[PDB]
Amino acid sequence: YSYTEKKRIRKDFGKRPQVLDVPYLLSIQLDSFQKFIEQDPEGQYGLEAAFRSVFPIQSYSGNSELQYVSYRLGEPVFDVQECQIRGVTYSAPLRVKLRLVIYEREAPEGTVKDIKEQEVYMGEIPLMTDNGTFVINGTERVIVSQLHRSPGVFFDSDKGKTHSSGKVLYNARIIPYRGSWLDFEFDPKDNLFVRIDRRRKLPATIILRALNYTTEQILDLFFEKVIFEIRDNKLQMELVPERLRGETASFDIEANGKVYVEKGRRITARHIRQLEKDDVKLIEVPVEYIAGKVVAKDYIDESTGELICAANMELSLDLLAKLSQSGHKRIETLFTNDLDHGPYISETLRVDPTNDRLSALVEIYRMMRPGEPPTREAAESLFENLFFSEDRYDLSAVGRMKFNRSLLREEIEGSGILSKDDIIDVMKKLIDIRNGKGEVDDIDHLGNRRIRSVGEMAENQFRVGLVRVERAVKERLSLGDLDTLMPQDMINAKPISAAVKEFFGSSQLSQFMDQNNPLSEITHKRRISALGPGGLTRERAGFEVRDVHPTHYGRVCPIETPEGPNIGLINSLSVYAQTNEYGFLETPYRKVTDGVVTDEIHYLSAIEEGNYVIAQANSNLDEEGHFVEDLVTCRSKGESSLFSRDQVDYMDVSTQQVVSVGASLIPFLEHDDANRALMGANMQRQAVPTLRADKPLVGTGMERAVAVDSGVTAVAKRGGVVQYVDASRIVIKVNEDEMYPGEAGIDIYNLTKYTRSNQNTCINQMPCVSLGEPVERGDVLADGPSTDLGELALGQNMRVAFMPWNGYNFEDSILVSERVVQEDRFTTIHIQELACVSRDTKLGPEEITADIPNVGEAALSKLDESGIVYIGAEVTGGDILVGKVTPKGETQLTPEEKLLRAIFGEKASDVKDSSLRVPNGVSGTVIDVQVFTRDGVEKDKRALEIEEMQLKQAKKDLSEELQILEAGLFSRIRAVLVAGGDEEKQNQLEQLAEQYDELKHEFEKKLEAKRRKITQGDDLAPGVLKIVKVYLAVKRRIQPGDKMAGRHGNKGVISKINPIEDMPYDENGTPVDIVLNPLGVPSRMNIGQILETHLGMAAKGIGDKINAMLKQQQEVAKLREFIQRAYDLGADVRQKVDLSTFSDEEVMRLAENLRKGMPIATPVFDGAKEAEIKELLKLGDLPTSGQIRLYDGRTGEQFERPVTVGYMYMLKLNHLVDDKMHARSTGSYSLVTQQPLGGKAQFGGQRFGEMEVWALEAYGAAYTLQEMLTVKSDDVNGRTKMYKNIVDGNHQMEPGMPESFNVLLKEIRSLGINIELED
C-alpha cells in the first residue's frame, strides 16, 4: 500500500481480489497522437506514412525531381496555462530538410547540383497537452473518435419488404479508403449491375468489357466448359459426374455398353456412382438438347468465311446443318442451371448492345461526367488514371487486410493498384451468395467496423494540405528552369496552416468541451459519435445498428448513450477497451492452457475471438490450477450455453470490463434495473462543482485511477518531501534522485484558482497534504474542483427519507430541510463572460473613456478613475463593464464648436456615446480582470498594472529559484572544501569566477527571452484593438426549482422547503436532510436506491461510533481494533486488509480524516448481498429492518408503520432556475416581420406552435387566440394602439391586416406570381 491513501481508506469489497492492472485511461488519445507525431524509423502511420507515399515528386515532363528523407520540428511559441487565459491558438513551427534533384537531357538517373538545404517554415500546427486536450482561441475543444462502415468486401441482406412485392435483394459494397465507390448489384431479370458513386444502374459486363476482356476474353476466364464433339458424323459429349445434380433426366443417356438412365425420372445418389465407378468421360448425345442450348465461343466457316454464331447466341437447325458441315471438331456451350450455376453473366452479355472495349469505355465517362463531350484519349487516360494509379487511388493497409480476408486467399498483401484478377473474384462471390449457398454478411459484427482516433483523423486531414500545394509545386517545377533557391520561396505557409484549420475549426468533430466535472472532462475524450464527415446522415438512420449486437461484449458500453434525436447512436467505450495493431477493438482474456487459468493475458480481435471459448466473468477457481464448477456458463458462438472445463481456451478476468467509467461509478447496477441505469450515466456528466465537496461514502473502487489520470488534480510525477505549502503554489524538494545536469530536483506546482470553464462554472484547485510532509512518485498533492483526497465527490452526502409529507412530495418531488442550506453545502459559482469591443475605424480610434458621459445622479463614485471597473465590485442593475467613447458627429466647424470644447471639456469635438454594459437582471461580483490590447497602439493604466505585477512575479519566482539552487549547489561544495582542508590558486579562482560570471548570463538571457514573451503576446487578429472582458461572477444559492437527483435515476424538482423546526427528529434527535417519494421506486425500477441508502446508514453508523472514541478523548489501541475487525470482516470476502502494523501517526491521521462516515467500496458487477449490509449494520448497532419508528419533529407522534430512512447521496445538476425561467412584457422585435425574437438573446418570446393553437381553438375562445396572434405579437402598432386602450379601461378591438401574412403575399409576389388586394 502507498501514501496519501493512508488518510482516507475505503473498505475494499467484492468477490474478486486486488492484483490486476488498470490502463492509463486517457491513453487512447495520447498513445494515438504520440504515434502520429513521432519520428518513426519505418513506413509507419502518422506523418512518415503521409510523406514517403506522397512526396518523391517531379515536374510535368521537365524532369526536375524533389526527393525526401526527414523533417525538423521547432520550439513552442506560448505555453498552456497562460495562452488559455490569453485567447491564442496553440501551435509550433516546422522546418523541413529539402534536397532538390534535376535530371539531365537524355541521361538515366543522375544529379548535377542541389544548390543547398534551404528549408521552409511549414506554417503552424496544434498539439495535445499532457492532460489530453486541444486549445483553440483560449477555449478547450476536443474531437471525438469515430465508427463507420469500414473498407473491405462486404455483403448485405435487405429482404422482403425492400421491394414490398415479395422479393429478396442482394447487393455489394466495395468500400475503399479514398477515391470513388463501386456498387455491384442484382435485378429481378437475373442480371449483374454497377452503380459507381450511387449513380445510375449500368451493367457489370461493361466493367469486364472495359478491364481487358472483350466478348471472347470475358467468357474464357469465368469457370469451366461444356465440350461437345462431332466424331463419326454424330453429336457427342465429354461428361463428368459432377454437373448432373439437382436436375431432371430428359433423354435416354446410354454409353459403354450398359443402359443406365432413361426418360422421365430424376437422379439419385445411386446413379452418380455408376458414372464414377464404371468410368464415364465420353458419351453420345442427341440433337434436341442442342436446339435450345447456347454456344460459348465464336466460330468461323473455314470454307465460305462467315459468322458461325456470335458469342452467347441461341441455336437453330438450319445453321446446325451449315455449322457442322463446315468442319468443327470441338463445339462449346454454357451450363446455366437455375439451382447451381445460375444464368447471371450469360443473360447480361446478351442484354447489352455492344461487345468491344471501345463503347464500354466510351459510355462510362459520358455517364461519369454528363453534359460535356468526350475525346479518344480522355477515355484512355481516366480509366488507367482512375483505378490503375498509386497516386489517385490507394487501398492501403487495413483495407487489403480485410479485402483479402473475405475472398479466401493465401496472400494478405499484393498490388497497391487494382489488379486484373481481383474484381473477377469480387464479381463471382457476389453471385455465389445471390444464387443461394451460404449465410448473409452483417456490418453489426464489430469485426466489420474500424477505429479512427483524432490522430488518424489528423492523418486524413494532412495529405489534402500536401496535395493542394503539389499542384503549385509541380506547375512551378515545370515552368521554372532557373535555380536561384527553390525550397524557400516556392513553398508558402498559407495552404498548410489553412487546410488544417478547416476541420479543427469548423466541424461537428472539433467542438466546445463540456468541462463541468473530472468525469465529464475524461469521458468526452473517451466516447464515440457516429454522425460526421464520411459516414452517417439523418436519411439512413432509424432502427437497427443503434441497438446492441453480440460482438460488443467488453469493448463498448450500452450504458453511456446520450438521449435526444440520436438515442443509442452516440455510445461510450468500456473502461478496459483497447486498439489493435490492425486498428480495431479488442478484449483481454486469460489463457487457459488446458486446465490452468494463467495470469499472463493475450488480446484477440472481433473475428479472432469467436472461435475460442470466451467465458462470462462470474466464476470460482481452485488451488493448483483446475476449475471449480462442473458446468460453467460461457460464450463463443454469440450465445450463452454450457461447456466442459478443459475445452475452455480463455477466461473473462475482470468484473467491470464491460461497463464504462462513469457507469462503473454507480453502485448496485445488479440490483437496479437496466432501464434506469442509462439516464443516470448521461446526466452524471452534467453535475455542478460545489465550493465545499463532501465525497461519496458508498464508493466503488474506480475513483483512485480516474482523478489521477484526469489531469484536473495536481499529480506528483516524482518523489521527495514538501518544502513550502502555500494556497497559491506548492513547492517540493526531491531528495531521492536529483536532476541530470545539476542543481537538485525540486518540484513546483502552480495551483489554479477561481477559473472559468465552457459551461459557466467555477474551477478551484485546493491543497491536501500538510505543511512539510514527505511525498512519493504518484501521489495527490492538491485536489481540484469537486474532488477530495483521491476520491471523486461531484455531489454530497444527504439524509434521505422515503415517505410522503402531505404531498409536499407529490410527483417525484423533494422536500429539503433548512439544515441542508445552513451547513453551507451545495454552494456554487456560475461564472459569465461579459466582453466588449470598441475600435476599428478609418478616421479616429475610439478612446478608452477616462470619463464616461453623461446620464444620472450617482454613477461617478461607483467606478474607478481609470475607466474599467475596480478590482472587485458588486454589480447590481444596469451599470457599465468597460468603456464608452466613440468618434461620431461631423456636424460643422463654426463658432459653436469653439463654443462646445468646454461644456464637454474633452476630446477635439463634442462627441461621446457608449460600447457595452451590464445586462438588466444579471447581478454579481468582480474577481480578476484581464486585458488584451493590440501591439501598435498604447494601453491603459491597468493593462500596465496587471503585467507590472506579473513582471514582479517573473523576477520574484526566478530569484526565489536562485535562492535554494545557488545555496544547494555552493554549500555542498563549501562543506567538502572545509572537510578536506600561488599562481595556480589564482588561475582556479579566475576560471571559477569566470564560471560565476558565465552563470550570470544564463539567467539574464533566459529573462530576456521571457521578458520578450509578455508584451509581444498582445496581438490576436487584424482589426480588433480593444479586447477587455469584465469577469463578473454570480453566486447562485440553494433556491426552489433547482435540479436534484440520485445516482440510480431519480430526477426530481424541489417543491417548497420546510424549516428545520417543522422537519422531523430521530430517537437521538437528528433531523433528515432530503425527503423523496416512495412512488417512483416501483413504477420504474430501483433496488440499488434501497441498498445504497441502507448501506449509507451502515457506513455512517459505524462512522458515528468511531468518532465517539475521539470525542471522549479515549483512543489508544482500542480505536485500531474496532476498525481492524471492521475491515477484517464484512461477511466473507477477499481483499481483506486489517490495520496490521499501524503504530501511531498513520492511525491518528487515518481516524482524523475518517470521521462521521466510514466509506465502503461496493462493486458494480459484484453488487453486494444483504449479509454484507447487515454484518456492517451489526458492527454499527443498527436495525436489520432498516426501519425505526421515529417521533415527528412537527406534531410529535410516531408513525403506525416503521419508516425507512437512508442516505441517498443526492447531487446537483446544471440547468437551474434562471436557464429555463424567462418572462418579458414588452420591448424589442425581430428584423424579418413585426414579431418578437427567437430566444435567450433579446426578447422573451417563447413560442406557441401548431399544437397549442389547435388546443386554443377548441377551448372555444376567439379572443385568447387573436390576442396572441393579431393583437399582441404580429402587429407592433396593433400593440401600440392597444397600449392606448388598456391602461384606462375603455377596451374593444380593431385589427385591420395582420402584418406577418403580407410576407405570405409578398414572397409569392416576388416568386413571379401576382397578388394584390382588389375588390
Binding site: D812, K1056, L1311
Partner: protein, 483 residues
C-alpha cells in the same frame, strides 16, 4: 418592392419544374425537356434519335417558352381540342358542350392567360424582410437571402453588355443557361444542384424554402409566436393552496402585469404621473407589493405544458399570493396534462382586457372544467399519494387497539384520533345521518347503524348529505374513488 431587373430572356420555376405541371399542360410538353432543352429513358432517346435520322435541327432556350404563349389563349380551347377527337368519333362532342356550359355558368370567376407563367420582369422582396444576420455585432457578413439576388442583378448586365460588345452563342446561350441557373434557384430550391455548398448558409434559402422550409408558413404567419406578456416556468407541488387557485412567483408577476400596475399608480395619485414611478420601479419597492395584492384576485392565469394535445392543456387558474420562486399548483390537474414532475416546463398566457377576461373564467378553467369531454368517466382522478392515503385509512385492519367500542357520530373521528384507539381498526357501528333524495324532492331518508372500518368512519361525517355512505366505503375504493 424596390427592384425591377429586366432580363433579356426569362425563366420562372413553379411553371418550369413541379410534379403537376402547368407549362407542360398548356403546351403539351414533358418537364424533362423544359428542363434540359432551354416517356422513355435518356439512352433510349439518344438511340431513338440515332435511329430516326435527321430530322433534329435543334430547339432553343427560354424564348422557346416565352414566345409560345404569344399565340396562346384560354376562352378558345373550347372550339378546338375536341375537333381532333371528333375526327375519330365520337363522345367528345358532348365534352365541349359540357365545358361550354361550364364557361357559360360564369362569368364571375375565370381562368387567366398562360403568358403570366413567364417573367420578363423578375420580382424581388422588399428591404425590411431581408436583413443581415450579424456575426459579432457590427461586421455584417453575407445574408442568407441576398447572395442569390445579387445574382439576378449580375445576370441582366452580362447579357445587356455583350449584346452591345458582340459575343458568340457559345458565350450567349450558356449565359441563358446561367440565366436559368440562379433565377431557377431564386424562387425554388429543390430537385437540382446549385449555388454555394455549405459555408454560411447550409442549404440555399429560396422563396420556396421561405414558404416551404419544413412544413409551410405556419411559424411566421399562422402561429404569430412569442407574444407580449409571456413567460416560461418550472415546477413545485402546492398542498396548502386550493384547486381553484394559482401559486405564482414573486418576481415574474411584476414584470408581466406592468401596464395596469402603473395604470393604478398614475391616475389614482400614488405616483405623481407615469414618470416619478419609473425611478421607484428601477429600485424595487415595498409599497408596490401591497397595491398588486388587489389585482391578483381580479385577473387570472392561463398555464400549459411544452407539449399539449388535449382540451386539458389550456386550463386556467385564479392567481393567489406566494413568496416562493417555483410555481405552486394543484395535484389533481397534473394527471389531466399528464406530467410526473421531473422537468416539465409550464408556459404562461395573458388574461387582459374585459372581453377576453370573460372567456377565461367562464369557459376553460379548473374552476369550470371537471368531467371528461371525450369519455363519460372522470378525468379528475388522482394518482400516487392521494389514492393510497385513503385506502391506507380505509381498510379491514388487523385487530388494532380497540376490539369494538361503539360511538354516536361527532364523537367518532376524535376517539380514534385521540389515544390508544388507532385510525384503521375495522368494525365500529355509528349513527350515520344519511340523506337520499327519493321520489324527487330534496333531502329525504333517515339515520342508520352500519358496519364499516374506522378511517372510513372518520371520513363519513365530513359528508355533506348525499351519497350511499358506508355501503360504498365497504369493499374498497380501488377504481371506485374515481367512480
Amino acid at each position: 418592392m424596390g427592384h425591377i431587373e429586366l432580363a433579356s430572356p426569362t425563366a420562372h420555376i413553379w411553371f418550369l419544374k413541379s410534379l403537376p405541371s402547368r407549362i407542360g399542360l398548356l403546351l403539351d410538353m414533358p418537364l424533362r425537356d423544359i428542363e434540359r432543352v432551354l416517356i422513355l429513358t435518356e439512352e433510349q432517346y439518344l438511340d431513338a434519335l440515332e435511329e430516326f435520322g435527321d430530322e433534329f435541327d435543334a430547339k432553343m432556350g427560354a424564348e422557346a417558352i416565352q414566345a409560345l404563349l404569344k399565340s396562346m389563349d384560354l376562352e378558345q380551347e373550347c372550339e378546338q381540342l375536341r375537333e381532333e377527337l371528333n375526327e375519330t368519333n365520337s363522345e367528345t362532342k358532348r365534352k365541349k358542350l359540357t365545358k361550354r356550359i361550364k364557361l357559360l355558368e360564369a362569368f364571375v370567376q375565370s381562368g387567366n392567360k398562360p403568358e403570366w407563367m413567364i417573367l420578363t420582369v423578375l420580382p424581388v422582396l422588399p428591404p425590411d424582410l431581408r436583413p443581415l444576420v450579424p456575426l459579432d455585432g457590427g461586421r455584417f457578413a453575407t445574408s442568407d437571402l441576398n447572395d442569390l439576388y445579387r445574382r439576378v442583378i449580375n445576370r441582366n448586365n452580362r447579357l445587356k453588355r455583350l449584346l452591345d460588345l458582340a459575343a458568340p452563342d457559345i458565350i450567349v446561350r450558356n449565359e441563358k443557361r446561367m440565366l436559368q441557373e440562379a433565377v431557377d434557384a431564386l424562387l425554388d430550391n429543390g430537385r437540382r444542384g446549385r449555388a454555394i455548398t455549405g459555408s454560411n448558409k447550409r442549404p440555399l434559402k429560396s422563396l420556396a424554402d421561405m414558404i416551404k422550409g419544413k412544413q409551410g408558413r405556419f411559424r411566421q404567419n399562422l402561429l404569430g409566436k412569442r407574444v407580449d406578456y409571456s413567460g416560461r416556468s418550472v415546477i413545485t407541488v402546492g398542498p396548502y393552496l386550493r384547486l381553484h387557485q394559482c401559486g405564482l412567483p414573486k418576481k415574474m408577476a411584476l414584470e408581466l402585469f406592468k401596464p395596469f400596475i402603473y395604470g393604478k399608480l398614475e391616475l389614482r395619485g400614488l405616483a405623481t404621473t407615469i414618470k416619478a414611478a419609473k425611478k421607484m420601479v428601477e429600485r424595487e419597492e415595498a409599497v408596490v407589493w401591497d397595491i398588486l395584492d388587489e389585482v391578483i384576485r381580479e385577473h387570472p392565469v392561463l398555464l400549459n405544458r411544452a407539449p399539449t394535445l388535449h382540451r386539458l392543456g389550456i386550463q386556467a387558474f385564479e392567481p393567489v399570493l406566494i413568496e416562493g420562486k417555483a410555481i405552486q399548483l394543484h395535484p389533481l390537474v397534473c394527471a389531466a396534462y399528464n406530467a410526473d414532475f421531473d422537468g416539465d416546463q409550464m408556459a404562461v398566457h395573458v388574461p387582459l382586457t374585459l372581453e377576453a377576461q370573460l372567456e377565461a373564467r367562464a369557459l376553460m378553467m379548473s374552476t369550470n372544467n371537471i368531467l371528461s369531454p371525450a369519455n363519460g368517466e372522470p378525468i379528475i382522478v388522482p394518482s400516487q399519494d392521494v389514492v393510497l392515503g385513503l385506502y391506507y385509512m380505509t381498510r379491514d385492519c388487523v385487530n388494532a387497539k380497540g376490539e369494538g367500542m361503539v360511538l354516536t357520530g361527532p364523537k367518532e373521528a376524535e376517539r380514534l384520533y385521540r389515544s390508544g384507539l388507532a385510525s384503521l381498526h375495522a368494525r365500529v357501528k355509528v349513527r350515520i345521518t344519511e340523506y337520499e333524495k327519493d321520489a324527487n324532492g330534496e333531502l329525504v331518508a333517515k339515520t342508520s347503524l352500519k358496519d364499516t372500518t374506522v378511517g372510513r368512519a372518520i371520513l363519513w361525517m365530513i359528508v355533506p348529505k348525499g351519497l350511499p355512505y358506508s355501503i360504498v366505503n365497504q369493499a374498497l375504493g380501488k377504481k371506485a374513488i374515481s367512480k
